[PDB]
């Protein structure tokens, strides 16, 4: 939802945003690439390079940590996924209850 | 007692000999009363006397020299107030002393065999401070094993 992820600044030149703003921006940029680069309409035996990037994009929305986590610069912590808000991989299940 | 582990350095084709004299603290930042009324961090630099000599083996240029500096800045350790407290950033700080088991060898009853029955076995455990562990335990097959880290 649009107002569920606001983009207001915190104080001065810093920001406090959700970790979904970095992940929904990738799935859409890995969607039309298979449609029109890749204008084919080929047999499926040819194309590899896009679903290795699009599946990589949607897995960070699915789960981070079961094969490979999604980390940010100077941060050895996985991106807070939609499942990680419920199960609490980082220890925030001890914070939800 | 910890300085004298890093002074003998032996580089091939360098021939360097680093000899030590003494450590002397420099000047402090402020006194013991401005660290609470102000935001004084009190970071006193540690300066150390050194004696090095060089005998280079790369190519004979005919020029050799031994330049000696009296004090070199290494580390930023805080100092101690006249009672025995420290300061680092803004607040007063005291490090609590540590009491634990010795850096040696011991012989306890048993560990690890809490899953099975674990009848008569004897074993040893060493506690180092840095490095890896070193255990010597037994099995029901009467064989001595080892556990590192």
């Amino acid at each position: 939802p649009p107002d569920l992820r606001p983009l207001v600044p915190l104080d001065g030149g810093r920001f406090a945003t959700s970790d979904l703003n970095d992940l929904y921006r990738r799935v859409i940029n890995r969607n039309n690439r298979l449609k029109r680069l890749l204008d084919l309409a080929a047999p499926d035996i040819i194309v590899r390079n896009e679903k290795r990037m699009l599946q990589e994009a949607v897995d960070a929305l699915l789960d981070n940590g079961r094969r490979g986590r999604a980390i940010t610069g100077s941060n050895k912590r996985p991106l807070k996924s939609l499942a990680d808000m419920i199960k609490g991989k980082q220890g925030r299940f001890r914070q939800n209850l | 007692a910890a300085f004298r582990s890093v002074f003998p350095i032996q580089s091939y084709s360098g021939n360097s000999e680093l000899q030590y004299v003494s450590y002397r603290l420099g000047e402090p930042v402020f006194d013991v009363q401005e660290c609470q009324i102000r935001g004084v961090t009190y970071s006193a630099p540690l300066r150390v006397k050194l004696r090095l000599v060089i005998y280079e083996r790369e190519a004979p240029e005919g020029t050799v020299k031994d330049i000696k500096e009296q004090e070199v800045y290494m580390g930023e350790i805080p100092l101690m107030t006249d009672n025995g407290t420290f300061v680092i950033n803004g607040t007063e700080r005291v490090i609590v002393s540590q009491l634990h088991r010795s850096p040696g060898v011991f012989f306890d009853s048993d560990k690890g065999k809490t899953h099975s029955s674990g009848k008569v076995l004897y074993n040893a455990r060493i506690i180092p401070y840095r490095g890896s562990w070193l255990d010597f335990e037994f099995d029901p097959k009467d064989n001595l094993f080892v556990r590192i880290d």
Binding site: - | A1, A2, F3, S5, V6, I9, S11, G14, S16, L50, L52, I54, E56, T63, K65, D66, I67, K68, E69, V72, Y73, M74, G75, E76, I77, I95, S97, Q98, L99, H100, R101, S102, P103, G104, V105, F106, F107, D108, S109, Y122, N123, A124, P128, Y129, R130, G131, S132, L134, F136, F138, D142, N143, L144, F145, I148, D149
Partner: protein, 150 residues
């Protein structure tokens, strides 16, 4: 019977297995398998049983002298394992954990030393490379030593 279930037969394959246990996949080299085991229990830069711990270590084996080195030797562990076999056979009893000859107070200055020896073993690796980074003899103030890892 430990030797019969021991796969190694000499010094080389022992160092290979000691590297391979510390990621069970491959033998390293000729040199790193020696350097890691020397940096397990026989070097101060990675293993310091500080000079009091030798004095407490000598009384656990009924030694005469109390002075010595911080790092262990090749004669100590065998003499410990002999006492392990002797306690297993029935002679002797267990040792006291909570007795103060073993339970020692570590001072605040010794704690600052134990939080300074971590920076020393990095700054020695700094002065190794900055021995080569120096021009001829300008490497006293800053071209040798850094105050960042300490």
């Amino acid at each position: 019977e430990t030797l019969r279930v021991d796969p190694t037969n000499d010094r080389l394959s022992a160092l290979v297995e000691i590297y391979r246990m510390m990621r069970p996949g491959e033998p390293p080299t000729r040199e790193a398998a020696e350097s890691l085991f020397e940096n397990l229990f026989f070097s101060e830069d990675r293993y310091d049983l500080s000079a009091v711990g030798r004095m407490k270590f000598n009384r656990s084996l009924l030694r005469e002298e109390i002075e010595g080195s911080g790092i262990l030797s090749k004669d100590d562990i065998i003499d410990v394992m002999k006492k392990l076999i002797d306690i297993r056979n029935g002679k002797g009893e267990v040792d006291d954990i909570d007795h103060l000859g073993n339970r020692r107070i570590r001072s605040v200055g010794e704690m600052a030393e134990n939080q300074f020896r971590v920076g020393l073993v990095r700054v020695e690796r700094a002065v190794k490379e900055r021995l080569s980074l120096g021009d001829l003899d300008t490497l006293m103030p800053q071209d040798m030593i850094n105050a960042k890892p300490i």
